[PDB]
Write a protein that binds this DNA or RNA. Structure first.
Ligand SMILES: C#Cc1ccc(C#Cc2cn([C@H]3C[C@H](O)[C@@H](COP(=O)(O)OP(=O)(O)OP(=O)(O)O)O3)c(=O)nc2N)cc1
Ligand SMILES: [Mg+2]
Ligand SMILES: [Mg+2]
Ligand SMILES: [Mg+2]
Length: 539
DNA sequence: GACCACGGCGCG
DNA sequence: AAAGCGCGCCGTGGTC
């Protein structure tokens, strides 16, 4: 490409190099643009940012986030990563997409700009005739990248002093647990080392091994194994408690306070748009889609996520979302009827689990039923179900039989999905998002059946993802108009931040936008709460 | 300092 | 662990 002076003409593709992968923390080291067989290299990257009308190119969102950080309203536009990811969601990295579709991902901005241009041309041609993928790109993914950029640049407020205080308390409890474990073992060891623990449990204390690890065949010390050994030796419960506390401390309590951005005073995640096989987003650096909530200490951690003073958090979560999606995809009359009648399958399974009438099912019971319902749907064994519930194998087998007998078109939908997947090589969501699953044709049963479970999960999980993404795209401009902010997405949940006086109106509007995103054979229902912290906003 | 595979586990 | 699926991050053990 012929070198031409900065600035480039409009519509040019950008290339940029960051000192580190996270745009909220990166120094913009270089910036370039490419168009019309010219490459324009910026003498001074930061000032040159002010010349662009939009970020168009590989990882466009990341440059947009950095621009927003610097107070520039630079929206992301076309991005070849999004085209590639829609063609095949195994296309997750610029390194791989470049190799597959026409170049090499290097560490120079000019080359990245020229690459973005070249890859866009080739990938755009590959989507020709692919109207459903094209619709996903234009109506969902491309606009969503703009929304995600704003979310990343906005961040979420964290009560740092609270977490610092919590760390000191948890450390003291961890010490009590570890000391008791060493007392019971007869000697100290590194309790964080599963290899050392294996030797203590199975060689020294002579507890029965229960399961093996996947890749190396060691005797497993997983929580499931420890659960089954809970009554074999007093050390086991102590280990389980130690595991819970150290997991929460090392992953959330300690690292999060150190990630507050100096300028914004907030915590900023990255919403990765081309990272999953199903069409879900992911979140990283830090992952804010896995903040604890299911246990008491976990709930204490979630309380650290708070609204700006004078504002409130609004949390909205789709009800029974993958079951509703399954009703639509499978067309099962019974499943459809459940939702037309306003019933709750989580509550119903909890009723059976705890042997109480539906009226007596408390929120804790209902929530315990969730992993059971989705586990069973997506192929969990009777052995596992019986172990997890401490019921006879025969009763677990019966539950699984009844579950599918209750919704007889579900198995029919699964079989149709797998047959079509074997023939075409891919399965698809309601909107036509694809996932290639070649191992449906594997000659090894273990491999093939694992591939089958992946394959029939994808249309359900992926359709739910498509719906949430479309809802985000519809909702964002409404929030801007009301002076509210979109902060986080957690798969079927959004967390927003609204001025106190407007929080009620924002809640109502967001609920309606999400429920009406795309009418199905069953209604979509959204649960919405408002509060000063993330825990209180989900009730 | 950094990379990795692994086991393990937090969320959806 | 076990026929649930989808993620990212932690510490260990082992390099490099
Ligand atoms: C306390 C607590 C507690 C919280 C969450 C869960 C869970 C879950 C799961 C979720 N999923 C997939 C399928 C779900 O439809 C989807 C959204 O997860 P949730 O919002 O937790 O479940 P839901 O929308 O089905 O039910 P709600 O009505 O929102 O409770 O993610 C899934 O595939 N597998 C799961 N185990 C277990 C315990
Ligand atoms: Mg939900
Ligand atoms: Mg949820
Ligand atoms: Mg792994």
């Amino acid at each position: 490409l012929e070198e031409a002076p900065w600035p480039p003409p409009e519509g040019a593709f950008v290339g940029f190099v960051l000192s580190r992968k996270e745009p909220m923390w990166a120094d913009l080291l270089a910036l370039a643009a490419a168009r019309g067989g010219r490459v324009h290299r910026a003498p001074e990257p930061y000032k040159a940012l002010r010349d662009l009308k939009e970020a168009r190119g590989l990882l466009a969102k990341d440059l947009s986030v950095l621009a927003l950080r610097e107070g520039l309203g630079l929206p992301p536009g076309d991005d070849p990563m999004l085209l590639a990811y829609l063609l095949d969601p195994s296309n997750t990295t610029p390194e791989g997409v470049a190799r597959r579709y026409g170049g090499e991902w290097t560490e120079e901005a000019g080359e990245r700009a020229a690459l973005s241009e070249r890859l866009f041309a080739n990938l755009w041609g590959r989507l020709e005739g692919e109207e459903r993928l094209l619709w996903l790109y234009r109506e969902v993914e491309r606009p969503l990248s703009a929304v995600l950029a704003h979310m990343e640049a906005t961040g979420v407020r964290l009560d740092v002093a609270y977490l610092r205080a919590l760390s000191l308390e948890v450390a003291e409890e961890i010490a009590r647990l570890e000391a008791e474990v060493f007392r019971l073992a007869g000697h100290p060891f590194n309790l964080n080392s599963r290899d050392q623990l294996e030797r203590v449990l199975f060689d020294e204390l002579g507890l029965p091994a229960i399961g093996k690890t996947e890749k190396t065949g060691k005797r497993s010390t997983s929580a499931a194994v420890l659960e089954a050994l809970r009554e074999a030796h007093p050390i086991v419960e102590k280990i389980l408690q130690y595991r819970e506390l150290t997991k929460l401390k090392s992953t959330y309590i300690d690292p999060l306070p150190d990630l507050i951005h100096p300028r914004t005073g907030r915590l900023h995640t990255r919403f990765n748009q081309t990272a999953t096989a199903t069409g879900r987003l992911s979140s990283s650096d830090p992952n804010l889609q896995n903040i604890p909530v299911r246990t008491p200490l976990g709930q204490r951690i979630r309380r650290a996520f708070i609204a700006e003073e004078g504002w409130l958090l609004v949390a909205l979560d789709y009800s029974q979302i993958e079951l509703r999606v399954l009703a639509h995809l499978s067309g099962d009359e019974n499943l459809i009827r459940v939702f037309q009648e306003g019933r709750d399958i989580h509550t119903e399974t909890a009723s059976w689990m705890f042997g109480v009438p539906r009226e007596a099912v408390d929120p804790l019971m209902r929530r315990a039923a969730k992993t059971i319902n989705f586990g069973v749907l997506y192929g969990m064994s009777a052995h596992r179900l019986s172990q997890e519930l401490a019921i006879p194998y025969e009763e677990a087998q019966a539950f699984i039989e009844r579950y599918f007998q209750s919704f007889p078109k579900v198995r029919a939908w699964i079989e149709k999905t797998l047959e079509e997947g074997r023939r075409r090589g891919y399965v698809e969501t309601l909107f036509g998002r694809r996932r290639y699953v070649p191992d449906l044709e594997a000659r090894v049963k273990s491999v093939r059946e694992a591939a089958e479970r992946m394959a029939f999960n994808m249309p359900v999980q992926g359709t739910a993802a498509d719906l949430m993404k479309l809802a985000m795209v519809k909702l964002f401009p409404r929030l801007e108009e009301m002076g509210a902010r979109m902060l986080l997405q957690v798969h079927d949940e959004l967390v927003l931040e609204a001025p106190k006086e407007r929080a009620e109106a924002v809640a109502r509007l967001a609920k309606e936008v999400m429920e009406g995103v795309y009418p199905l054979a069953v209604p979509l229902e959204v649960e919405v709460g408002i509060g000063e912290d993330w825990l209180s906003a989900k009730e």
